[PDB]
Write a protein that binds this ligand. Sequence first.
Ligand SMILES: O=c1[nH]cnc2c1ncn2[C@@H]1O[C@@H](COP(=O)(O)O)[C@@H](O)[C@H]1O
Ligand SMILES: O=c1[nH]cnc2c1ncn2[C@@H]1O[C@@H](COP(=O)(O)O)[C@@H](O)[C@H]1O
Ligand SMILES: N[C@@H]1[C@@H](O)[C@H](O)[C@@H](CO)O[C@H]1c1nc(-c2ccccc2)c[nH]1
Ligand SMILES: N[C@@H]1[C@@H](O)[C@H](O)[C@@H](CO)O[C@H]1c1nc(-c2ccccc2)c[nH]1
Ligand SMILES: *Cc1c(COP(=O)(O)O)cnc(C)c1O
Ligand SMILES: *Cc1c(COP(=O)(O)O)cnc(C)c1O
Lengths: 810, 810
Amino acid sequence: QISVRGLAGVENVTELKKNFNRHLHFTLVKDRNVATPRDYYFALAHTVRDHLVGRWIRTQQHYYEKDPKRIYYLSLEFYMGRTLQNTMVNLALENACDEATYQLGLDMEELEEIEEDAGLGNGGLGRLAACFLDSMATLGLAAYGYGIRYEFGIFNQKICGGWQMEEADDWLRYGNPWEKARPEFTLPVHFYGRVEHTSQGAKWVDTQVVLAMPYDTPVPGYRNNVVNTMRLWSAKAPNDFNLGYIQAVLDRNLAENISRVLYPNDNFFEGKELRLKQEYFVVAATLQDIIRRFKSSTNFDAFPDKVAIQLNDTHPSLAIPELMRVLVDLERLDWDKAWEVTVKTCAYTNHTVLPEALERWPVHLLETLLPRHLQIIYEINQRFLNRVAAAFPGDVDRLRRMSLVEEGAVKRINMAHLCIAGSHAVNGVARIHSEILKKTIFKDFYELEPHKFQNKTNGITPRRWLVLCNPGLAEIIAERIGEEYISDLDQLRKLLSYVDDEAFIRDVAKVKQENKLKFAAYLEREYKVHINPNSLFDVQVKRIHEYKRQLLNCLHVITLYNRIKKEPNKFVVPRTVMIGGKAAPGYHMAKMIIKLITAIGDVVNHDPVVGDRLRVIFLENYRVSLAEKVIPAADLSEQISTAGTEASGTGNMKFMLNGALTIGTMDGANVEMAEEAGEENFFIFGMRVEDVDRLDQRGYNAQEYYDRIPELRQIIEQLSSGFFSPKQPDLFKDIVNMLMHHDRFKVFADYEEYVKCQERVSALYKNPREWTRMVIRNIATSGKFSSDRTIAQYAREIWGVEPSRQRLPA
Amino acid sequence: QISVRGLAGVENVTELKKNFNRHLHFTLVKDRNVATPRDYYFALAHTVRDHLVGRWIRTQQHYYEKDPKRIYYLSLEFYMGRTLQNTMVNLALENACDEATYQLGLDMEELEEIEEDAGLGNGGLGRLAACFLDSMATLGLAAYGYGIRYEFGIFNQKICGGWQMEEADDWLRYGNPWEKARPEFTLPVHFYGRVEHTSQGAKWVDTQVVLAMPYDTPVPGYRNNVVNTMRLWSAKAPNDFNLGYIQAVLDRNLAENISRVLYPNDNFFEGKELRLKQEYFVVAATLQDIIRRFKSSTNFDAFPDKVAIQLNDTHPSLAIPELMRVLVDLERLDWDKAWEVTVKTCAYTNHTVLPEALERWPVHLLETLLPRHLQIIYEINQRFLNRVAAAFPGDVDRLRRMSLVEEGAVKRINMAHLCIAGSHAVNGVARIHSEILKKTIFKDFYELEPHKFQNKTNGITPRRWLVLCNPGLAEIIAERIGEEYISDLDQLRKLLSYVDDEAFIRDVAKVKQENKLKFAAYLEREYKVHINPNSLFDVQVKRIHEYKRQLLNCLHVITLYNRIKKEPNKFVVPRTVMIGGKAAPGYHMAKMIIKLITAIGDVVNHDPVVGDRLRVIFLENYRVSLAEKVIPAADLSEQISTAGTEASGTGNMKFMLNGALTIGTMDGANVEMAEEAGEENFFIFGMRVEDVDRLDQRGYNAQEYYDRIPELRQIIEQLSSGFFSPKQPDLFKDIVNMLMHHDRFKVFADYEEYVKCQERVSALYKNPREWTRMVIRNIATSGKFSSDRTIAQYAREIWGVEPSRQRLPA
Ligand SMILES: O=c1[nH]cnc2c1ncn2[C@@H]1O[C@@H](COP(=O)(O)O)[C@@H](O)[C@H]1O
Ligand SMILES: O=c1[nH]cnc2c1ncn2[C@@H]1O[C@@H](COP(=O)(O)O)[C@@H](O)[C@H]1O
Ligand SMILES: N[C@@H]1[C@@H](O)[C@H](O)[C@@H](CO)O[C@H]1c1nc(-c2ccccc2)c[nH]1
Ligand SMILES: N[C@@H]1[C@@H](O)[C@H](O)[C@@H](CO)O[C@H]1c1nc(-c2ccccc2)c[nH]1
Ligand SMILES: *Cc1c(COP(=O)(O)O)cnc(C)c1O
Ligand SMILES: *Cc1c(COP(=O)(O)O)cnc(C)c1O
């Protein structure tokens, strides 16, 4: 149908058809008379998977032969989403598969909807890991993603009576055709035990053993025949575990629980023993695999020339002391040599400055679970502080601040300090964030070792986030500038030559309109909700958090409602306000925010005076597959975190690529997006980081805003008095109390500027030609936010390897 | 190579080779440079599986179209063993696969050794279920085996310091290529709750739900293109189960434990709640499947014309009240109509008379777990006893004896009484056993309803237990009488015409010798033990039990040792005495018997005066795959249970088919084997059932035998004084005390006759020509013991269906 989906040649189509029928019969053991759509989805998935296999085998062979430097990306989260469409796009099979299925009487788009998301992450951090794998394969890097194969990924969200309920995400129920179990490469991981000091060094003895069994998933690059590996570990008890008899067998679950469930917290640290087990499990299995592969290619001096380990936040920080353990206790290197190797091998990416998200493990947990690692951490700390003392003599407070060990009621290990000490590179994830790291929380470390500190601004893959989710936009772009932009997104700048072209303006607006109609129908079909597709689609999708300020959006929505009720016969630009996202199950305030959003909807959506001028919809079960549907449909992207709190953001970049304008604060990557597009093409409002600091110095008093802004006072009185909860008048008192007395994120302080900025948005939306011209200016300057750019920078500036766009032979 | 293994045609061989390479590449994702023997085994298994699929689909289609009466064989155990070779034999692919693999540079016999046994049974009962499935498919019956897919089958046995240690049987670790998950046919099963009585009958409410997910395994018939289904249920928690968050997800194990592990007791009842859950789980899921299939083919009068349910012992006895529950509570049939349907549908096979093996569930367990089923059981009981009272007026003791409810400290339900009441047919498993049922434990029931009581003597499949395990014997038979005997084992009678044929005598002896050499080499390779292959191979393999009298064998072995030590320079026929079998983990005396056997070996095998004249070997990890190796190698089969205790036995029949002579008591099927072969061709000894009864009436006094038999006294003094345990002189005191004071199985009472009979065995072994002629007489008369015969009798006399040897089209 469309050019960017590839060729549908007669021989290709014939072969796909016969292999589809082969898999239905032999693999699924069904005849066509009782096959369901799910059976047809599996038969297609197996057919497409067969095309990956030859390339996967050849790619891994090529790495064994050439022996390039290997990149190991360690993460507790890989938020992959669905695989079928992405695989077809990357192998140029989409049009052929569409045709093959069409000729068999099937609708491929319907089959695609049957696939479960692989939901092995919480949000941005996990999704970044997934985008990075796609870019590393596309850039020809010998890269491996290592993680945990959780049996249960991020929970499915149901809304009941306006409240979030959680259900287990049993994503493997029907099988996962993309993975290959490799039980032959199972490795042991040790826990508990004690340390014995012999004459030939330390020995970690009397341990409990859990086995780590790997499952491998192919990661195809874009049209280059490179297929890399994501290796995910699953926990298995040994066969003599606990070995009355029946109970001993049932108690194997105690070991296997390590890989059972993803911790469902976004940007928050929960210091539970099971989480610590997960972190060590992934590190210990991965490092054995790395060392095996290195030995099969005695002399560890070359280790950093052949291996890079990238730590995705501090979650895999135990890699540092584990590498030291292996090199010192098992390989018998002297400490100084081992430390040199470790530092040159490891690099640390920080993704947050919120204090509640920083990992600080109690010493007593590490002492019991990982006694040798604790000894190694203490030794690292002593040697590190000896360097600090020599550089800054007499500065005793600096020694306390920089210590890996935090004093207090409970002594804790600061994992970020460990990562900085043991890594040759430390980066933040947007320019403003990397500057904040150097000026505030890691200032001391920067003064000691300025050379370590870098920036690598985040990005998103344009394969999933343009070609896959918005083929109509990809096509109209390709008609003008060709297809090369898909792996070289900077070529979108060429679109600035079309900003005055009437045909292009029309086509851009037409694609948005089609995406809106398609999303409005999806809503009606799957959720029985009716929306006006001529309205401005105002969208805030992201995890529910105080710092992300869904509450500020709520205040604007109520302001609009109150303005309509005051002057009902005045024209206002119609809006559909859509908010979606999961709350962590234990995060009470986030759960209350969801309830407020649905409660506002219950009033606004049923007021006959409002009509179709304002609708408030809570989008249930926000996840990667839903992002792919809603983001192409959005007109306005809400990126409204308090300045200094969102390290980068990546949803922001997805919306920019897909033809939404952005209303946002100067936070995270929003700063760089505005710089690329021009501030005149962005709806910037609110306090900058410097203004937040000035307010904190004099003291934030929310009462002052309440006293001075009548529209704000009215909303608080409505919340307090039960206007949005007539049967439970005090339902929102915790929200009111927080806003008035304990608001760390200064919602009221940005309210006036936010409302005024929203009025400018509405004014521009009234002039569709100028709205669309501004959109073109945003899409055209979005090239910097390709994860291909991000990964090329990591490769050159951190890993010491050169990217390549050259194809392997087919 | 040999004719009974089929044709190796050029086109077949070419196609197997290309499909093998296809599976290695696409299914296993390996290239030949790193493939292991395990990868090659899987590639062959997938290649062979592909040939089953078309036949499986066609067979199940044919049943949907023709709508024959369906046979449902319900069992807690299916002891399947390995599948690869059996599938090749039944599809006539063995020679083609041998050739195809040979041309690829691989040895198929080595690949076959990699496959795990499917060990989902304890011994005879589970293995009978497996033989029956093979015979039902071979006889063209629309039959389904229904059971539980245990994650852990019968434990792997290790011997350490002469003691049994247990290890989990992680049989699914590398995957199971034979099964197909069918998550789309998942069904709910209810537990706990309470009963509400409305105006429209009873309702079982407030239950906990566990999901039953089926896995289907193909069951090929012998060369007839019929492939039936074994459907095994696996337990899954619903997604809202327990739905802080993390703990709720981890607690899904409480539901999923139902299918985790096989209870490892043979011929013994352990009344644990988990076992009861297992029994209901299999019944409840199975019955829904049965009813679904019946409705898709309102009027339950035709139910018994379309459905037969065979209960494999009382383990699935809850089928009776579950069927009543469904028909009365859900379909709203009146009680009397429902009961008529139930009785005509169900039939019960009893497999034991040992009191400790009979299921008697405490009422309090059923009251909590299955409250509606308990109410239905009480109603069945009241109506049943009303019939008894009308037939035998005033016989109040008979009412107490026949009640389904047993009075006492703890009230219990007698499940055997429930099965008799609710079944149209009740059978035992050998003639002597079925007579014992009518004369002793079910005498009262027989007097009320004599028409219900039948015999169906057990059998074994000649596919696995001759063709597969002893191809050399199968071939020399086939050279004389053709191949038809493999599905019509009565044709072996034709071999009586060859009993004086010198060439046949030579060939029979040569095959045995080859099997002995092959087994003697296996022992050396896998277990570092050396045996004399010219010795008489004296074999007792079966689960370790007091009633099976491994101890009587032990007394004979010590007698032989003592006779050698007394007269070392006298000739004795050399023997290798092999004993193997698993002990239930909680069965202390069985564990002590294993220790005694290894302790005897430690003395006998290292005494230089004995030399190679006597060796005692404990065969570790006895299981179906080991039976296939040792049984073809045996000269003497030990079948020495106390008369009246072994319901049938089936190992006995395996040995007869494979050219061993039998030393045995007149117990179980030994009686019928002796009758078929002639008593002159069998080594019969010991008390008959009648002699056991006479001894019980006057009182068994073991001291009398000790006082009268000096050789026996010497052995007991050796045991007591630490001759076989010098470092722990009192190690065997429990064994001595049991033999002298509390022996229910009268070991001493059969000792003298056993030893004398063993002397006759040795005398015959000295004359190889006459030994071999007696062997031919046994093999020739073994035809009655085909499970094809057994199944034809069930089909005609119980199920009301006609067997068929006609082939479906290929
Ligand atoms: O010893 C070897 N001989 C031949 N090829 C090897 C060997 N070791 C690794 N390879 C190749 O590279 C491997 C990739 O797996 P890895 O061990 O995870 O790196 C295999 O799939 C082979 O293609
Ligand atoms: O509604 C139907 N239409 C066509 N074929 C059916 C239908 N129901 C069952 N079958 C056939 O018989 C089935 C065997 O599965 P069953 O439901 O377990 O008996 C399928 O595999 C079909 O081949
Ligand atoms: N909030 C940032 C977000 O601004 C950023 O775009 C994303 C990727 O760098 O990482 C997110 C992030 N997620 C975590 C996180 C996730 C799970 C557990 C603990 C921390 C820390 N940081
Ligand atoms: N001992 C008989 C044996 O004589 C008989 O050959 C076999 C098959 O009928 O069934 C065995 C049997 N096994 C059980 C059993 C198995 C597991 C749990 C409880 C009872 C009962 N009966
Ligand atoms: C991109 C993405 C995120 C991150 O969005 P932010 O607005 O940067 O927090 C979270 N969840 C999903 C499902 C995503 O695709
Ligand atoms: C046949 C068989 C049995 C039953 O043997 P009996 O001597 O009848 O108790 C037990 N276990 C295995 C592995 C078998 O093949």
